[PDB]
């Protein structure tokens, strides 16, 4: 529950509880960058209607 590991800050790579996809900030950045074809999220990709 606590995230102190001697000073090594893993916040940028640990999952973000304050987001719906629960991706890490670095994971969120990576998913936002690669979006030429993939929408970056699967809110509507499940049915594509």
């Amino acid at each position: 529950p606590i995230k102190y590991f001697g000073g090594f800050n893993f916040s940028q790579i640990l999952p973000d509880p304050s987001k719906p996809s629960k991706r890490s900030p670095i994971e969120d950045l990576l998913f936002n960058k690669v979006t030429l074809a993939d929408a970056g999220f699967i809110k509507q990709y499940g049915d594509c209607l």
Partner: protein
């Protein structure tokens, strides 16, 4: 489900290991349910559970 429309299977809120991958985070199997308190082998619906 995101994979599509599943017919003949009932959703289970519990989490077992995946036997037959349906897709999009869903897996199905053949299960005999005695929890129905009636007929175990012949459950009230089709015996396929996702």
């Amino acid at each position: 489900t995101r994979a599509g429309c599943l017919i003949g299977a009932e959703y289970v809120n519990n989490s077992y290991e995946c036997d037959i991958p349906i897709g999009a985070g869903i897996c199905a199997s053949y299960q005999t349910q005695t929890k129905s308190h009636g007929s175990a082998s012949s459950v009230a619906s089709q015996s396929i559970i996702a």
